[PDB]
Design a protein around this ligand. Structure first.
Ligand SMILES: [Mg+2]
Ligand SMILES: [Zn+2]
Ligand SMILES: [Zn+2]
Lengths: 83, 99, 1335
RNA sequence: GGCAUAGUUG
DNA sequence: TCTGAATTTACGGGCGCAACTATGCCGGACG
DNA sequence: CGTCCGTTCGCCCGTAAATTCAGA
């Protein structure tokens, strides 16, 4: 569970970009295809995303890097699936 | 009193008022100011578009919540279209110019 | 979808373009069958199908015919949403004037033809004529006529000539006008004229004409020929119980217009007489004017038992229009409301939500989980399972509540802490359980309050509730730095009773090995809670590099203080709980915990404080009795003495020794003194009520009285209330406001008789009515503050400027009202703070002043710090983060995006309800310093000040200015400049009732340019023995010597004039009228001695006027330019004062009324912005003469005086940003190389960017002139017309925007709310930046 | 289900 | 006797938020 | 019953228009 998000705020020092990054990660985990990077403790996707933010293994840059790597993998796999 | 979804008014597709009518709480003007004082731009947007008077937006939001996906299509409130029609019903041509 | 909104006039071709069919019949429904008429208001061929994908006659009823049009009736079978958006039109038989452009004040048509509104109203409503095609006759064009004049013109000029009537005449005038030629003629008249009112009228007409030509509008479109009709789903008929219908007030005003139009059309076909058709046209005009804006013309038509019906304007304007009722604030789904209760067991981040409310609010989530777990394939089964409330839906509800916040909101959301996000805890009840600590933030007691719950649906909403709106994130108030979760009343009583001591208790003086042994002793009954013992305290100090360093000692404390020390976290010193711990002590304890340890330890500490305070307040059993309100034994004798004194004063009055007024004042003062003595006696008797000893001598101690403890701890009550509980409640005031001679000598422990209770009812009714009528004023003020400053958002990170305000402690004249530490706390410095020793940079230039910097400034005795302000920021469209400073909600700098305009407006307006509706005595030992002074010594050795605005400052030994005083012109100083003297004796002495004429040179007195009889007046005194020569004004003397002003000359023993020291002009003083001169002709004088004697707000409304920038009824006049001063013509209506500079524009002059008391003589060289008269200073003059920093300092000080008088702590950032929003426009004075007009008022940001980009090139920018507008005038004169329309005066704003063809980029916060997109402030700032970058 | 009126709650 | 400034006067704007209960009604008058 | 067409009486303020000074 979560009580305060001060650690997440100090790791992403804007208090507004934290909300957007956590929403992006939680939407990646909720639809989601992806799986949590932290041991889930019967927490919902937003809380898991914030707990990942606390550990410093997720931020905006890491999410963008992973998204572009996944886009490159999708481009490659479709390339060899057709031609 | 409490309400998830119920009836909506005719002129503006916003939830009814009161509890004798299964109505919704009025997130008034000062509550909008209070959300603006925070950084809650998405909470306010879902408050005044999806949860109040975006007919397609609210139907899609209900379907998404039942599907387990918490995400909203913003849309445009119907009361703004009503205001546009009422101002256009005077001798005043008001329009939303192209992007 | 779109990026801007365009508004303009609606051409009849455009109106026909909107329409999908003309409305011809004034019939809505058949009232027998519910089918719509053929071509009535509620139609089907015009507006669309009644039901989805079905024809009106029923020939087509399926989706296979999607798009076809029936032939029997002609209804395009499609959705009914088109019936919600299809518009129609009415073809008026006669042209009709649009009332909005006729009666807008100013009238657009009226000043488009420069014709007075009365004449155009006469011509429009068929009672006068106006001429078109005057030709070579005896008639002009705009000349109005009547029946007799028209008959004379027709019998005399029956040739080519056309005097028309009604709106046809006005339309002909509008169409037969060339806009460009009128612009040229008006411009040349404006350039070739000399009048001021003519220039104003001409420039208004030119502005209107140029705005008309600039846009695509045409003047003739202001006269309606095609009238649109609203879609029938926006003005519906709701069938009620019975065959009748609900009569909407829009189908009644369309019915009348259609009736009159059809009647006129059928009367024009049969060629009815002229009078009949004129009357019909007038009736049609009035019907249309009532439809568009009912009641603006007058005689508002009513339909249902004398009730003025709502027209289109009434539906788009007002408190119940579309902006303030359905767009700015809406009704929302997933919302509930219930009575709140306490639930003390809750943690600060959670609230108790009833099971049934949670089940009803989270129904879609429960449906989703039931379908996910396979318990209901369809949604109907899930709905049935939930409405039966089976045993499995509760587990689903419990697992969807898990970490889903809910927004709790109380009804008057005064500030942003009025809505907070909590985690639900399912409660077997029907009432919400609200955490006790958040009650102060909500201003919520539990006497029957109700709160509303809202469910954040989407993931972004949930994360905003958790990361922004959580109750554990809102520790500090956003209005100041103080915490907002301070324990209120029971926690402070428990902590006060626990942390206390008595002279002798159980286990006094025993030695304890730690707090655990203290708790084990108290809980077992072996020691009292408050017993003085020595304990071993191991406190941790983190003065190292973030490392906790242990320190163990033997503290002499009490058992309760150790038990509380078991709660305090590791980083705090033990001295924080070694006191009595009232309310302020707990507040500062939480503040220090937040400042040292952070957020999470502070939240845990607050929860633990609340728990232990409730526990030990219950353990105390602190009750209230009838014997706890101890009545002093000396009250009776004090009242007897006061009654004897009033009896003796009555005896002294009835004998004629004193008058009525002084007797009243004496009685009031002696009763006040008696009341003060009674209050002092009762307070002493309650403070030392306990005298306890059993081991020797009696010892005084602070009383354990219940009432006294509840008052002293700060829990509840105060000195005034406890005073009425025991002592006399004192003087009462009549409803007229005057104090009553006889007070209420009875408290509430004793019984008030009938008269005293009746007077108290006077007082209480006045207060209740004032509160009721003051809440509305506070709400209006805060709404105006929000509207003026809502688009102001922190956009940049550092504007990179070196301008700021010089913050100094504010001194009223005595002790310092506010120190410098709280005025520069958390604000970025502007310059380098040089050390008070010698030119050493103490702190860097752009460092945020947190507590460490503030305290090290305090220890170095820094008195003036130049700091960066919002008003002095060079950021276009916003404010940089460094000019604002600390967030005041967190301890860091303000984030890029955070909306500070709304926060400022809420912070200023929230405490609105709390607000109501000779000699210098130096007190401290320090130096004496005079500033803005030019003094001179007399023969007696006493200095006299020859300056005007000299400030006398008592300085301490450290250099800090401790005391401030104002020295009038001609005050006697027994001391010198810069010489340290003793505090306690008066240093400056003068007489306020007499203005001196003190000299600057010595010699003999000569009254030159004086003739006895008319220039002066003789007074032969009989009670003194000395004569008098008094110089009078121009209106009181004789008509003999009023054209020459007498002068006073100081000469030598020979007669030659003495020159002014410094200049070549002899020292002559122009003596004004009404001067009491004791001296005669030929009297020896010296330097520094008098020559003659020259004789002589609110609370919340004061703040409202300061923010609205009202010019006071007695404005203090200032000086526009420097130089010498003189007088002019002898009262040309009033007295003319001419200020001639040394080398500037000599012909500057002003007209001053002669009745007001002037201040400057003819022998003072002043600068710009110096006082010439006295009284309140108009803020516009301060802005235009001293600058922007002067006016912002004035406004912030003048509002902070009110807020400090009423005990309100508001930071100055909010007032500074409101002031910044006040001065946002500017008037051009020099056109320069830009495209602006000569003296048109443009926004400051636009002229700033224009001349900034011009400065980059080889041209020269345009010089501007800043303006100060009130909050409502500034919020109505905004470049975005939607904000102004949603604010006051929707009709006028919309009329102006339509006529000028204004375009709104919706770049603020209110526009995006109305449109329904992301606010460009919080999480939406990134989205708006992304859409700007990817435009 | 819209307005008005009257009363009430904080 | 004309003409501009200042004064006075008439008039249109505004006057807190949220919530609950009840009745009356939507029009009074010819075939 | 079925149908069917016409009440002045508060407080405050800003602003434009009417009125009155005050000349040359
Ligand atoms: Mg209450
Ligand atoms: Zn058909
Ligand atoms: Zn700045």
């Amino acid at each position: 569970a979560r009580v305060t998000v001060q650690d997440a705020v100090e790791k992403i020092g804007n208090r507004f970009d934290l909300v957007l990054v956590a929403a992006r990660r939680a939407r990646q985990m909720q639809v989601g295809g992806k799986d949590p990077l932290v041991p889930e403790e019967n927490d919902k996707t937003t809380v898991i995303a914030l707990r990942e933010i606390e550990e410093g293994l997720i931020n905006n840059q890491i999410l963008d890097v992973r998204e572009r790597q996944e886009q490159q993998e999708q481009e490659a796999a479709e390339l060899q699936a057709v031609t | 009193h409490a309400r998830s979804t119920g009836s909506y008014s005719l002129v503006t597709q916003q939830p009814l008022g009161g509890k004798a009518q299964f109505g919704g709480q009025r997130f008034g003007e000062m509550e909008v100011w209070a959300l603006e004082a925070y950084g809650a731009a998405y909470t306010l947007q879902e408050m005044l578009t999806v949860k109040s008077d975006d007919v397609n937006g609210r139907t899609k939001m209900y379907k998404n919540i039942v599907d387990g996906n918490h995400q909203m299509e913003p849309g445009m409130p119907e009361s703004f279209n009503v205001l546009l029609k009422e101002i256009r019903s005077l001798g005043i041509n008001i329009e939303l110019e192209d992007e | 979808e779109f990026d801007a909104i365009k508004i303009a006039l609606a051409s009849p071709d455009m109106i026909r373009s909107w329409s999908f069919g003309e409305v011809k019949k004034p019939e809505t429904i058949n009232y027998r069958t519910f089918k719509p008429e053929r071509d009535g208001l509620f139609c089907a061929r015009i507006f669309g199908p009644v039901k989805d994908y079905e024809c009106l006659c029923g020939k087509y009823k399926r989706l296979k015919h999607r798009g076809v049009i029936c032939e029997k009736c002609g209804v395009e079978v499609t959705q009914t949403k088109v019936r919600r958006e299809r518009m129609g039109h009415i073809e008026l038989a006669s042209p009709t004037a649009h009332i909005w452009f006729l009666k807008s004040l100013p009238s657009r048509i009226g000043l488009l033809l420069d014709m007075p509104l009365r004449d155009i109203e006469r011509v429009l409503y068929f009672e006068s004529y106006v001429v078109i095609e005057g030709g070579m006759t005896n008639l002009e064009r705009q000349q109005i006529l009547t029946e007799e004049q028209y008959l004379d013109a027709l019998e005399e000029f029956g040739d080519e000539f056309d005097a028309k009537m009604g709106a046809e005449a006005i339309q002909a005038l509008l169409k037969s006008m060339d806009l460009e030629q009128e612009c040229e003629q008006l411009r040349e008249e404006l350039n070739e004229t000399n009048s001021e009112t003519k220039r104003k009228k001409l420039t208004k007409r030119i502005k209107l004409l140029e705005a008309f030509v600039q846009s695509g509008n045409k003047p003739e479109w202001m006269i309606l020929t095609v009238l649109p009709v609203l879609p029938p789903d926006l003005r519906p008929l709701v069938p009620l119980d019975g065959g009748r219908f609900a009569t909407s007030d829009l189908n009644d005003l369309y019915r009348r217009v259609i009736n009159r139009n059809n009647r006129l059309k059928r009367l024009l076909d049969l060629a009815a007489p002229d009078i009949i058709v004129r009357n019909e046209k007038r009736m049609l005009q009035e019907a249309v004017d009532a439809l568009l804006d009912n009641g603006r013309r007058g005689r508002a038509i009513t339909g249902s038992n004398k009730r003025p019906l709502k027209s289109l304007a009434d539906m788009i304007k007002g408190k119940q229009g579309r902006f303030r009722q359905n767009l700015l604030g809406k009704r929302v789904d997933y919302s509930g409301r219930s009575v709140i209760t306490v639930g003390p067991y809750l943690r600060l981040h959670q609230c108790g939500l009833p099971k049934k409310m949670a089940l009803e609010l989270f129904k879609p989530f429960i449906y989703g989980k039931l379908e996910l777990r396979g318990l209901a394939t369809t949604i109907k089964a899930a709905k049935k399972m939930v409405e039966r409330e089976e045993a499995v839906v509760w587990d689903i509800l419990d697992e969807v509540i898990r970490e889903h916040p809910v927004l709790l909101n109380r009804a008057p959301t005064l500030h942003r802490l009025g809505i907070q996000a909590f985690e639900p805890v399912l409660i077997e009840g029907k009432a919400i359980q609200l955490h006790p600590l958040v009650c102060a933030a909500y201003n919520a007691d539990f006497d029957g309050d109700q709160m509303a719950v809202h469910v954040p649906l989407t993931l972004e909403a949930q994360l905003e509730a958790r990361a922004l709106m959580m109750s554990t994130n809102n520790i500090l108030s956003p209005a100041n730095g103080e915490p907002i979760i301070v324990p209120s009343q029971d926690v402070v009583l428990g902590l006060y009773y626990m942390t206390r001591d008595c002279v002798n208790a159980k286990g006094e003086g025993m030695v304890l090995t730690g707090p655990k042994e203290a708790e084990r002793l108290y809980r077992s009954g072996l020691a009292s809670l408050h017993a003085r013992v020595k304990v071993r305290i191991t406190e941790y100090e983190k003065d190292a590099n973030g490392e906790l360093v242990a320190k163990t000692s033997l503290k002499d404390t009490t058992v309760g203080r150790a038990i509380l020390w078991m709660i305090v976290p590791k980083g705090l010193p033990y001295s924080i709980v070694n006191q009595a711990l009232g309310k302020k002590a707990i507040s500062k304890m939480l503040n220090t915990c937040y400042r040292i340890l952070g957020l999470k330890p502070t939240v845990i500490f607050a929860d633990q404080i609340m728990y232990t305070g409730f526990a030990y307040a219950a353990r105390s059993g602190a009750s209230v009795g009838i014997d706890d309100m101890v009545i002093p034994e000396k009250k009776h004798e004090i009242i007897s003495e006061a009654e004897a004194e009033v009896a003796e004063i009555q005896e002294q009055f009835q004998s004629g020794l004193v008058t009525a007024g002084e007797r009243y004042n004496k009685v009031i003062d002696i009763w006040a003194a008696a009341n003060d003595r009674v209050s002092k006696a009762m307070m002493d008797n309650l403070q030392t009520e306990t005298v306890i000893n059993r081991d020797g001598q009696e010892e005084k101690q602070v009383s354990f009285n219940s009432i006294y403890m509840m008052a002293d701890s700060g829990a509840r009550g105060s000195a005034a209330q406890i005073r009425q509980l025991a002592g006399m409640r004192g003087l009462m005031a009549k409803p007229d406001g005057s104090i009553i001679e006889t007070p209420i000598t009875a408290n509430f422990r004793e019984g008030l008789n009938v008269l005293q209770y009746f007077i108290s009812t006077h007082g209480a009714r006045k207060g209740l009515a004032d509160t009721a009528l003051k809440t509305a004023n506070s709400g209006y003020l805060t709404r105006r503050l929000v509207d003026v400053a809502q688009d102001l958002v922190v956009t940049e990170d550092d504007c990179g400027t070196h301008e700021g305000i010089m913050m100094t402690p504010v001194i009223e004249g005595g002790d310092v009202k506010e120190p410098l530490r709280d005025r520069v706390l958390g604000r970025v410095t502007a310059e380098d703070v040089l050390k008070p020793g010698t030119a050493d940079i103490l702190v860097p230039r752009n460092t945020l002043l947190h507590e460490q910097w503030c305290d090290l400034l305090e220890e170095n005795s820094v008195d003036a710090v130049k700091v960066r302000s919002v008003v002095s920021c060079d950021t276009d469209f916003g404010v940089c983060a460094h000019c604002y400073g600390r967030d005041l909600a967190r301890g860091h700098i303000i984030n890029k995006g955070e909306a500070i305009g709304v926060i400022a407006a809420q912070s200023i307006g929230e405490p609105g309800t709390q607000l109501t509706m000779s000699s210098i005595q130096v007190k401290n030992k320090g130096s004496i310093k005079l500033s803005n002074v030019k003094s001179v010594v007399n023969s007696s050795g006493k200095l006299v000040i020859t300056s005007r605005n000299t400030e006398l400052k008592l300085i301490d030994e450290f250099g800090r200015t401790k005391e401030s005083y104002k020295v009038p012109y001609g005050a006697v100083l027994a001391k010198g400049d810069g010489e340290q003297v003793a505090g306690g004796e008066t240093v400056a002495n003068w007489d306020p009732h007499t203005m001196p004429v003190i000299t600057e040179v010595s010699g003999f007195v000569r009254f030159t340019d004086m003739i006895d009889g008319q220039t002066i007046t003789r007074q032969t005194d009989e009670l003194t023995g000395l004569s008098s020569l008094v110089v009078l004004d121009s209106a009181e003397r004789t008509a003999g010597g009023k054209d020459l002003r007498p002068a006073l000359k100081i000469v030598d023993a020979q007669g030659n004039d003495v020159l002014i020291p410094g200049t070549d002009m002899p020292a002559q003083y122009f003596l004004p009228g009404k001067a009491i001169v004791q001296l005669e002709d030929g009297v020896q004088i010296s330097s520094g001695d008098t020559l003659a004697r020259i004789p002589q707000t609110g609370g919340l409304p004061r703040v409202a006027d300061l923010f609205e920038a009202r010019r006071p009824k007695e404005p203090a006049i200032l000086a526009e330019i420097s130089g010498i001063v003189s007088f002019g013509k002898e009262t040309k209506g009033k007295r003319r004062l001419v200020i001639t500079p040394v080398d500037g524009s000599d012909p500057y002059e002003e007209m001053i009324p002669k009745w007001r008391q002037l201040n400057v003589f003819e022998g003072e060289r002043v600068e710009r912005g110096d006082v010439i008269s006295d009284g309140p200073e108009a803020p516009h003059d301060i802005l235009r003469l001293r600058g922007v920093h002067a006016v912002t300092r004035y406004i912030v000080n003048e509002v902070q005086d009110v807020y400090r008088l009423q005990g309100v702590k508001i930071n100055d950032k909010h007032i500074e940003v409101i002031v910044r929003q006040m001065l946002r426009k500017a008037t051009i004075v020099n056109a320069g190389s830009s495209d602006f007009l000569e003296g048109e008022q443009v926004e400051y940001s636009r002229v700033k960017i224009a001349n900034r980009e011009l400065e980059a090139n080889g041209k020269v920018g345009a010089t501007y002139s800043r303006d100060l507008l009130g909050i409502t005038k500034a919020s109505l004169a905004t470049e975005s017309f939607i904000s102004a329309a949603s604010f006051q005066e929707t009709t006028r704003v919309l009329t102006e925007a339509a006529v000028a063809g204004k375009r709104d980029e919706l770049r603020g916060l209110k526009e995006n709310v109305i449109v329904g997109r992301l606010i460009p402030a919080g999480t939406g700032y990134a989205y708006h930046q992304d859409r700007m970058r990817r435009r």
